[PDB]
Nucleic acid binder design. Structure first.
Ligand SMILES: [Mg+2]
Ligand SMILES: [Mg+2]
Ligand SMILES: [Mg+2]
Ligand SMILES: [Mg+2]
Ligand SMILES: [Mg+2]
Ligand SMILES: [Mg+2]
Ligand SMILES: [Mg+2]
Ligand SMILES: [Mg+2]
Ligand SMILES: [Mg+2]
Ligand SMILES: [Mg+2]
Ligand SMILES: [Mg+2]
Ligand SMILES: [Mg+2]
Ligand SMILES: [Mg+2]
Ligand SMILES: [Mg+2]
Ligand SMILES: [Mg+2]
Ligand SMILES: [Mg+2]
Ligand SMILES: [Mg+2]
Ligand SMILES: [Mg+2]
Ligand SMILES: [Mg+2]
Ligand SMILES: [Mg+2]
Ligand SMILES: [Mg+2]
Ligand SMILES: [Mg+2]
Ligand SMILES: [Mg+2]
Ligand SMILES: [Mg+2]
Ligand SMILES: [Mg+2]
Ligand SMILES: [Mg+2]
Ligand SMILES: [Mg+2]
Ligand SMILES: [Mg+2]
Ligand SMILES: [Mg+2]
Ligand SMILES: [Mg+2]
Ligand SMILES: [Zn+2]
Lengths: 206, 155, 127, 80, 98, 24, 60
RNA sequence: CGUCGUCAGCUCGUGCCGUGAGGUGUUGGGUUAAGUCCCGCAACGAGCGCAACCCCCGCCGUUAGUUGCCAGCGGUUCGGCCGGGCACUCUAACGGGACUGCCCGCGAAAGCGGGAGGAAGGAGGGGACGACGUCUGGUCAGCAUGGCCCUUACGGCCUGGGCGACACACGUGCUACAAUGCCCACUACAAAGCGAUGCCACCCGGCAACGGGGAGCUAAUCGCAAAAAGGUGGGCCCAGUUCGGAUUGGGGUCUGCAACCCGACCCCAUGAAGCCGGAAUCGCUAGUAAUCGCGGAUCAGCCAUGCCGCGGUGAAUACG
């Protein structure tokens, strides 16, 4: 058990926070829990949408919430009778009456969180873990990218003895603080246990 | 020192005499990094030599050191059996370190209650050719030579 | 008229002003022997002047804040030597061989975790 | 080297429950869980059954043992 | 004379939010007191890396609060125009005390 | 030493004040 | 950290002393930083993502 | 997450060798902190790791100046206090600078030795960062989770007790055995932090802990705050001591609904072992060790001598 989160490790450089708002030793923790409550439902609901991310900005009872997804349409709803019920949830929790944008993702094959979700999915439908991975890396690596890697945890194939499946292409230099490597995890639940899935995508250096 | 041959540290010259050999001696006296208290001690001990003696302290100091320098010492070694104390010459660098160390060590074993009083009397006895310092120095050379039988083990 | 040179050491800055005249050194107002009341050290801080036979040529107004008197002492060593080179650049050719020009970089090593003091590692039982 | 300040603490459970018994007479024991409360004058004579986490032990309050607390007489542990 | 401290978690979220008040005032008021830094109040957090035992690792976290000054000399009028709602920062706090 | 409450150092080390270490 | 104990949140403590922090994200009762209301473990995790704004990785 | 281990390694693609497991490359010579680089070579390249990119510290410059300063002048209740000024310090944001670039020597090359210039020189100092994998390592008591198991209860509430028991044994530490010291008085130098129902200047009561009163501060402009070791003067005079503060008696403050079990703190008294520690064993190679103090997290308060961090003073030694 070594190596740090490639994100927390790059927050300074090539990677910004999922919440960029100021506060003080009396506010912060509150505006904090809020975001957690936010993504709470968002991730419980917009799963099918393709919940690639949930950014949250602030100013004063104002909150950005630029929820990114691969299939924006699934957010909107019948004409828009959902992104009306979602904006509804906003004040349902915190009566801040804020925005709630939506931004499609330019190729969900470069969105590690998704790339991992995909793989996590397949694993639950009882797919071939190894191929699923061979393929994933391929897609991700296919639609551009300079490198990629995927890692499913243990109990592969329902095995009684946990293992750790690989697969990786191109470059995925982690020790290089400036690679800009998307990272995504996916907790693939299952009938015999849990299977962690991690995805990394290397794109552009300097 | 497995890679390189550690270069001897180069210390500044004595604030007063400008002698590096003295700064050394001071550092040895120093304990808990109180170079002041140290430096002080030494100097007051240099004055106690001005009175109780004739010549300037530096002269005595130099002489004292020069008498405590062992020109031979025994160093243990393992050889099919036990540990055979092998006599070998003592380098110039170590010759000094051992002298200054032994001075302070012998010095602080003295009965006089004042630090400076002890250093001065030891330097004096040392410069004269007596005192625990010179003793050890002789004790070593006694060990050495007296084990010449093993001398053919050199290093 | 006047000459200046900063000078820093082990985290302590010093303002040095060399003005022709006797040699009265006013560190934080007080006289040299005032601020450095019985510290065999001090003296050194004036070694840059003696290095060029001066000393009895300039009076010196000095300020200092940060660290400890010995640190401050060293800083001065730099200042007095720094200002002295400005005053006359031909003085660098003499203070370099003695290195009063260099800024002693030795600082305090950070206190690492796991260890007791940066390097002093905790002891352990029969391993 | 004791301490309290001003307001010698006593739990009302018995403070009143005891000062009432005075208004009448002596009572056959008085079990309580407030081993905190300070033993005050108007107790000398009564027999308070102090608990110890398992037992309700009887304690005959005497003058000499006023300033003390209840627990000091109802020992907690059991030793070798 | 316009005290206006700026405090953000980013040294550009402020250095921008302050670069506005810099020229959007020079173009309607005196040269202004320019933007002034001010020491930053850093907060470290030291947690044991892994859960359960292994108390000799930790890893460090810091949440540094930067500060800005500014101060527009002369409480102008036309300066207060281009400086009324032409902001751009998202993660900043700005107290006004002219 | 640092362990004698009734001393200057005793108060310091034990991070406190009182007679033996008053706040000026 | 059984729900039956995450009940604490309930104001009515009986006495202001009996109150305690507890992670707002896991229920963790020990090492629960105030400024975040999070536990040492939780702090670590979120911080790594980006859910903790301004919060970075200190080095010096 | 720990660990081997920041160790100098682990591999892949294609070609080539072998029936084959595999081999070559990655071996060899030179070199390096390093599979770092150079040369050679049936291999030619690539990936993970090393290095670099990020942070802090050394020097310098610009932008900004309620930090700073008679640098320089005027006034001064002579406090950088008032005016004034961005010079210097500094605060914090950007940029410069070092590349074996240059000089001599050795070398096939890499690079090694030495020199100048330079704040800094050959990875300038310290961080973050820890490969394919190993230990059926650690944690289901952080959380998540397959399975099993209890469901008037293996669930829930409360009061009380326990986690603080002791004939003993070990680990990690603290204070110390003293004169390079202990005590009192006076006096001087720091960095990094923290502060609203909080830091609390200052005044008075109390030996005091602390209390009553109450100014300022959204904190480079107020407070915690005294830095300590140090310097100067004086006391002690070698003694279980003016060393050392255990233990115990007594009085009291403060937090808290409540300090018996089981809080810290102050004051009087008591004043223990301990005279430098057997066999054996631990840390550290430079501002490091040693030594001196300061802040913080958690936190009502606290059993912190612990932990994480900050600066003062500042060594010895390395043949091998
Ligand atoms: Mg230190
Ligand atoms: Mg710990
Ligand atoms: Mg649970
Ligand atoms: Mg509590
Ligand atoms: Mg808690
Ligand atoms: Mg290495
Ligand atoms: Mg091959
Ligand atoms: Mg064969
Ligand atoms: Mg073949
Ligand atoms: Mg092969
Ligand atoms: Mg091999
Ligand atoms: Mg081979
Ligand atoms: Mg090699
Ligand atoms: Mg390489
Ligand atoms: Mg400059
Ligand atoms: Mg060359
Ligand atoms: Mg690295
Ligand atoms: Mg096991
Ligand atoms: Mg389970
Ligand atoms: Mg316990
Ligand atoms: Mg004493
Ligand atoms: Mg009074
Ligand atoms: Mg100010
Ligand atoms: Mg004296
Ligand atoms: Mg006695
Ligand atoms: Mg005594
Ligand atoms: Mg004795
Ligand atoms: Mg506390
Ligand atoms: Mg206790
Ligand atoms: Mg402390
Ligand atoms: Zn938690």
């Amino acid at each position: 058990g070594n190596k740090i989160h490639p994100i927390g490790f790059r927050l300074g450089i090539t990677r910004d926070w999922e919440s960029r708002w100021y506060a003080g030793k009396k506010q912060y923790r509150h505006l904090l829990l809020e975001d957690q409550r936010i993504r709470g439902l968002l991730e419980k609901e917009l799963y099918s949408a393709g919940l690639a991310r949930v950014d949250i900005e602030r100013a004063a009872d104002n909150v950005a919430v630029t929820v990114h997804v691969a299939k924006p349409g699934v957010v909107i709803g019948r004409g828009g009778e959902r992104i009306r019920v979602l904006r509804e949830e906003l004040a349902k929790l915190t009566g801040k009456n804020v925005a709630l944008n939506v931004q499609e993702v330019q190729n969900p094959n470069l969105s590690a969180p998704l790339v991992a979700q995909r793989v996590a999915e397949q694993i639950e439908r009882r797919f071939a873990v190894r191929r699923a991975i061979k393929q994933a890396v391929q897609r991700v690596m296919e639609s551009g990218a300079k490198g990629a890697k995927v890692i499913v945890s243990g109990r592969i194939g329902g095995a009684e003895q946990a293992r750790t499946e690989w697969a990786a292409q191109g470059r995925v230099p982690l020790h290089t603080l400036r690679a800009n490597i998307d990272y995504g995890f996916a907790l693939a639940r299952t009938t015999y246990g849990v299977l962690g899935v991690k995805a990394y995508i290397f794109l552009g250096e300097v | 020192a497995r890679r390189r041959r550690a270069e001897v540290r180069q210390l500044q010259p004595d604030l007063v005499y400008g002698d590096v050999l003295v700064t050394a001696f001071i550092n040895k006296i120093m304990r808990d990094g109180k170079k002041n208290l140290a430096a002080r001690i030494f100097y007051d001990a240099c004055k106690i030599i001005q009175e109780k003696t004739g010549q300037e302290p530096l002269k005595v100091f130099k002489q004292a050191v020069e008498n405590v320098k062992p020109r031979m010492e025994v160093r243990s070694r393992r050889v099919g059996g036990a540990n055979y104390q092998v006599p070998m010459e003592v380098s110039p660098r170590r010759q000094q370190s051992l002298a200054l160390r032994w001075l302070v060590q012998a010095a602080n074993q003295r009965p006089e209650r004042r630090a400076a009083v002890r250093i001065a009397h030891e330097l004096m006895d040392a410069a004269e050719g007596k005192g625990g310092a010179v003793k050890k120095k002789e004790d070593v050379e006694r060990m050495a030579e007296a084990n010449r039988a093993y001398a053919h083990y050199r290093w | 008229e006047q000459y200046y040179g900063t000078g820093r050491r082990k985290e302590a800055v010093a303002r040095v002003f060399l003005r022709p005249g006797n040699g009265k050194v006013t560190v934080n107002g007080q006289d040299f022997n005032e601020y450095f009341q019985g510290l065999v050290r001090a003296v050194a801080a004036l070694e840059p002047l003696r290095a060029v036979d001066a000393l009895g040529r300039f009076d010196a107004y000095i300020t200092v804040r940060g660290g400890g008197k010995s640190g401050q002492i060293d800083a001065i060593k730099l200042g007095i030597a720094r200002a002295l080179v400005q005053y006359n650049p031909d003085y660098r050719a003499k203070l370099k061989p003695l290195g009063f020009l260099t800024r002693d970089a030795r600082v305090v090593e950070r206190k690492k975790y796991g260890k007791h003091k940066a390097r002093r590692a905790p002891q352990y039982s029969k391993r | 080297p004791r301490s309290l300040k001003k307001g010698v603490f006593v739990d009302d459970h018995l403070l009143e429950k005891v000062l009432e018994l005075n208004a009448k007479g002596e009572k056959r024991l008085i079990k309580t869980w407030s081993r905190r409360s300070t033993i005050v004058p108007e107790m000398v004579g009564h027999t308070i059954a102090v608990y110890n986490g398992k037992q309700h032990v009887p304690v005959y309050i005497t003058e000499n043992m006023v300033g003390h607390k209840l627990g000091e007489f109802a020992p907690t542990r059991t030793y070798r | 004379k316009i005290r206006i401290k700026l405090r953000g978690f980013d040294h550009k979220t402020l250095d921008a939010s302050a670069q506005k008040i810099v020229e959007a005032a020079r173009r309607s008021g005196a040269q202004v007191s320019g933007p002034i830094p001010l020491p930053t109040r850093v907060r470290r957090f030291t947690v044991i890396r892994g859960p359960f035992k292994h108390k000799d690792s930790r890893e460090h976290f810091e949440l540094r609060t930067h500060n800005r000054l500014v101060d527009i000399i002369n409480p102008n009028r036309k300066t207060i125009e281009q400086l009324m709602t032409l902001d751009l920062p998202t993660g900043v706090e700005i107290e006004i005390k002219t | 030493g640092k362990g004698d409450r009734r001393t200057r150092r005793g108060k310091i080390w034990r991070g406190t004040y009182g007679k033996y270490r008053p706040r000026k | 950290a059984r729900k039956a104990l995450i009940e604490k949140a309930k104001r009515t403590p009986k006495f202001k002393v009996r109150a305690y922090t507890r992670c707002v994200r896991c229920g963790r009762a020990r090492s629960v930083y105030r400024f975040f209301g999070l536990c040492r473990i939780c702090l670590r995790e979120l911080a790594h993502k980006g859910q903790l704004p301004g919060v970075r990785k200190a080095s010096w």
